[PDB]
Amino acid sequence: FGEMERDCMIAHGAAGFLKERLMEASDAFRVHVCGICGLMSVIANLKKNQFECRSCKNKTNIYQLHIPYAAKLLFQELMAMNIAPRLYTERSG
Amino acid sequence: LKHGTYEKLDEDGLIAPGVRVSGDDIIIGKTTPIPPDTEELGQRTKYHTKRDASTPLRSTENGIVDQVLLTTNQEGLKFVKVRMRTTKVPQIGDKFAS
Amino acid sequence: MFFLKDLSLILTLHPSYFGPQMNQYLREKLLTDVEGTCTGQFGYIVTVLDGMNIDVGKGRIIPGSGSAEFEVKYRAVVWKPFKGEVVDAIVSNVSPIGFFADVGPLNVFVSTRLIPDNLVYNPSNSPPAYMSNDELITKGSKVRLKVVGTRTDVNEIYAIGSIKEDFLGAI
Amino acid sequence: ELAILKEERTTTPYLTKYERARILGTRALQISMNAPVLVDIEGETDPLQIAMKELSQRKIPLVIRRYLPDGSYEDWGCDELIVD
Amino acid sequence: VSTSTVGARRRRAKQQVDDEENATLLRLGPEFALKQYDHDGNEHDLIALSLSESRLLIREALKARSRARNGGVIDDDELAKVTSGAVANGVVKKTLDYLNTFARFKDEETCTAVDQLLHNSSDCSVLHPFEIAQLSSLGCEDVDEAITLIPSLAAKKEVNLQRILDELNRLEDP
Amino acid sequence: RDPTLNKTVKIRQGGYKGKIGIVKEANGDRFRVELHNPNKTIPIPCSFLLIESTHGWVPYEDFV
Amino acid sequence: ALEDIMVHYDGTTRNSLGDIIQFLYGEDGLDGTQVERQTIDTIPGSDKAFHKRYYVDLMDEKNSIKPDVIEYAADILGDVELQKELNSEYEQLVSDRKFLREIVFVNGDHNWPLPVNLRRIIQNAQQIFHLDRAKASDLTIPEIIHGVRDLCKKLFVLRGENELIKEAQQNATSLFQCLVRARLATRRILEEFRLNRDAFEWVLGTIEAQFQRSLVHPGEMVGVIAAQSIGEPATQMNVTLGVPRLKEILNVAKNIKTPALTVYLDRE
Amino acid sequence: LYKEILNVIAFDGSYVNYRHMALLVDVMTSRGYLMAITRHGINRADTGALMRCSFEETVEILFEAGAAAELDDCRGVSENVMLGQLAPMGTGAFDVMIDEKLLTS
Amino acid sequence: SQFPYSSAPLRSVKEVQFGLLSPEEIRAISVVKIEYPEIMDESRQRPREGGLNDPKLGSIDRNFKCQTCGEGMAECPGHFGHMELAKPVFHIGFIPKIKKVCECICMNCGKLLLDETNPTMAQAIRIRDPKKRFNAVWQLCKTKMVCEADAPVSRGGCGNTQPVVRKDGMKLWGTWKKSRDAQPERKLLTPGEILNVFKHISPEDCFRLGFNEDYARPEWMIITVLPVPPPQVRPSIAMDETTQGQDDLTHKLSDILKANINVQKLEMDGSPQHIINEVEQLLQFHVATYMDNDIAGQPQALQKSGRPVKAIRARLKGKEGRLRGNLMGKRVDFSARTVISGDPNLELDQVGVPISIAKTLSYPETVTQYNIHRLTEYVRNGPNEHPGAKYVIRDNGDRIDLRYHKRAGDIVLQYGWKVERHLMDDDPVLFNRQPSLHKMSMMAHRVKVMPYSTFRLNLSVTSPYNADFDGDEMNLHVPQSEETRAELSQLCAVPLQIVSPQSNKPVMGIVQDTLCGVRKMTLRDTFIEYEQVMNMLFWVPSWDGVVPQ
RNA sequence: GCUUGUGCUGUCUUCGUCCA
Ligand SMILES: [Mg+2]
């Protein structure tokens, strides 16, 4: 599903179909993010039910996101080049 | 092992000409040795020492085995070639030109 | 120590409950999910004030799943211990390593290394107790202890007290 | 604050095609997940057809929140938007 | 589970010493700071509650909920059983027992007089609400005892602590 | 596991009578048999088959 | 370049930053699938033909409405209030002719894409209400005047009571109102189309409904649609022209291949 | 600019509706100066870094955004596409809420 | 519902805040320190701790679990480590920016060469945009070549002359006009010195330069500690049945770690400055080519085979890069492709689908009381008969593969479960032909299951697709949800696309022999007898049963 | 007494198919 097909689906106005194509029919992934630093550095043990961002030293302000696996890979490669992409779930102003 | 069948192989691990083959069926049986695990704790005849490296038929193809070649390579190990034959009849969607 | 706090909860409702009794069902679900819970950030939530007249607002339909998400804001009474605070307690169990007390729902453990030496543990006593010449502390006896450390769990709080300082011990 | 009072609503009073498609999809999904139906179905079984029947009779229990570019919004009921 | 009305608090570089919880230093953290905000965003003060005020509030709320659930038609056990959840029932039973066995003021009018004395007083206009709750809860008898139990009151020597304690003992039912 | 998997079989009834095949899948009575000449696999009930043995063709019941 | 451009619920065209690109999409707020080529009847012709087609004089007997097309043909001559209404209509038509001929279309072109096909609506009304036969019409002239005038103020592109909103709304429907007034003229309705009361009300309601249906829908991604609509002809295709000239235009090249001036001289 | 684009399009007899070319030249002249449809024109805007990097000069744009501590507000379609979210376009330009008042019937 | 339950609330991303990573943050988010170049412990499995494949960095194996989070390969995202560098090095992407900042400030007392007293500087301060603010400040302070000890009253200036700094390779040279002509000395500006100078810059001066105190600090452009990506970023491949080859990034990290140990040992034991310079330039080269191997004016880092090293930068750019190749467009599931054929007996919005494609593709239908009987009939039919089904999905998400189920006839369906039934008649599907020049290249059709292996189209839709039947192929996409099906059937359907917005005219018409025949049949001298008239009238689906006179 | 096994490389190069 190339870029031109994406533009055609934008021109149709079908946002739900585009989201389903690019996530459910493809690399859908779930990550946890700290609510303070906004980094994907949370250490989650789901069956032990314990979450922790060791850097920010917090256990309660943690959320889960559904993002493409390629987006996760891109953010990790950016982090490898010392760039800090921080994902926040609220606006500031 | 693979999900395909192995009953069409002979003792030497090679299929014989004249046999029907479907997709994924195994036509060349090959194994490579592997250092055995702690299964020497006792497994009389069922301890794994080999890993399967067999050649399956292409999943979209089927036909008859036409000829099986056996020889040795330049170095000196065995070397096999299997030829499959099938007939293709014209149908809707086939390309023709003048 | 008890406090009044403005709390919020996110409630997700399945489409099978989209009926006229949606508001009341959300209220009872909120009550069952809030009353008696223990969160380390806040402490212990004991009751919710005005529990039958809480505004729930309009729920937002989650895209791709149909279920509605509600933001419910409420005021509740919350209790949380603090480091270096002196509170009363009631002894619940006696052990050679120390005694276990109860401060409401919170259970506080005090080790012998935070107990004065004259309060020697007597296991032969009926019931077993940490007793001195003029003091006798056993199960059900009023004790005043100072909280030194607090341990936070996933949905539990563990507190450690001490009675080695003045104006503590038996009361 | 961001909400706009019902008397001074200035957006179009007609249901756009995107809103119609999204409302039909959401209602069909809810019906397929065992939500109560508000219209009498004669012999219909398909959730999308039941949702379309609900829309034609103005019985869909959903609200459309239209967002303005500055951040404010207007709330419109599915029963007060004209559908062709 | 439940989320406070205070949000944001993103990453920075500076570290402060007023971050650890400590009753003695009167550092209650951001979520229990002296300044709070309601659902409307207006200014709001931290609301401490003594055991008398807390007991009155929990009894009032519980009896209101019990009356509402019964169609508008006193025992602690039945009132605790009104609530739902076995762990919730145990927690409210433990709180009811703790409050009952340490209730300094079981009367509404006595609690009202105590709150008015501890709020409208000129000396108490500077007192932190946590200090007020601790004084009304612990039932101290001496200035030295109160200072030892509550180290924050040591730095506030402009408070008529002894006469306030004697008034509290007088209001306390023997 | 059925005793008829990967065994040469002959069809005795229906529209494919007298065609030699090999049993590939056998779950509940609907044996999947590949046909030697038509490059295809067809479903067939166990009643319509004839399993080869050392002494001529045997029916399904008389073999299992 | 155009991917993030969308029509919003206030009618404006904006990008992802909220910067306004157009205060109304297409300067008329219409969908690109809802317009057809129509002729504006006040633009072409001579002054004699325009006067003959549109002017109705109730004093001169040979330059009035015909007597076999109206049942009220007797008590019509000599009226002054009705003559004032007809004069107001004619002055509005003359203003429209001046506006279109002098500001909008100066070369006389009058076949332009507009919404709501009026010819189709008129012939549909004629077929539905059986407007054949020499039967006189019961449609009074003030009814025609007030119906057309009210119709020309219900074509809502923008909603609101602000004065700027009203000015933008009046601006957005100028050409379409000119088309409607040129078609639904009193003499034309009475003689060429021969509508009656029911047919007239049906035509007015149909025009209003179809104009409401021709507006662009908020949420449209008109930027991507414009990009595809411009790039698609480029796929199937001494002054440089074609793809190199399109590249020069889109890159804003400083040194184009064939610079040129178009110099116009004074009349003499 | 509209006249030149119209000349180029209409020379070979083709026809394009006015609104498309009007939107194009309005984007090309909205900033007060001529903005070319190139990386020098498009990527010198105030749009989000994630939206600009997906066109051209990805790594340079990301390095500049990191060094400048840029904040992407994720309002564009490209950011939501590459984050796997419902883009605020078409059917995603509004929210759907549950009507409790109507449900009483 | 394909992910295991988590008590963390589910939210979406509203803002992305960019910035640089500080050494404190790199150390804090790390789970292990990497100091051993050897990948394998003793060539006997169980990779060495503290190495580049430490088991705390994450698990990329089926049977092994991550020792940091305890999750399996499918769920573990990977964890970062760090690698302390013996000497600081330049970040290859920020060297011109470091040069410009060095021009902007004073190399001895870390202060801007000009203050707000200059009105032009105040105007440069006023602009909010950090890039333009930095540009203006740089355009001003570049001219100023001397720190001012007193105000042009002491501004704190040390008075020293500002050198001219020129870039060559990755090395900056600062030419001081030491005290008309004299002998000027150009000395190397080592990364440690610039780092120390940047560290003294006040926060307010940092803000004046367009940097941010919290997220983008000027001394963080110098690498003192290197974050180590998890194995998920740099997976190993299986070259043959036995030997497995390491990723390029792993080899480059091994080279970096060897150079670091070399620098450290050299400094500790004995220090001839020339050898220090050589080995430290080798370390700088390795760190620079680990991130950017397309550096102009110097040779590329090569593999043992002679192919150049694949750097991180080259993973993110081009058609096959991360952005264009895996985010703006990707490969998707639930799709089909085959040759297309014409069908005069199909409706305009219908598509003919081969039976094998209908068996392969599926739609997950929710079990309700309106369809439970039909769905259990489909489940009884199985995955090899049409109409059948392939999977039964429980509420908890467990799939039941109907191929390998011995009691598929004894499966009872509960309300709320999902059945992945085969593609059926009248299911909406999206149909597409490349290149997709306009939005009529993707339209939603209705499925009709037919024999033979081609897709079938009405001939009037061949114009918007620009397709013919001499070998063309077209793609098909199956929606997987009720909302997505409604979107396809109400927005993208073929009848809704008849009139295009490009030229406000139809894009579909009567074509080819239908056009020729309609011209021939409507000629004035064409007459038809009663029997043929009856046949043609019965051929009309919309005919009302009344024969005309 | 006897029970059916559960998956796949990477990187280049060349030749082709349908548009353009
Ligand atoms: Mg072709």
Ligand SMILES: [Zn+2]
């Ligand atoms: Zn964090």
Ligand SMILES: [Zn+2]
């Ligand atoms: Zn892990």
Ligand SMILES: [Zn+2]
């Ligand atoms: Zn200086």
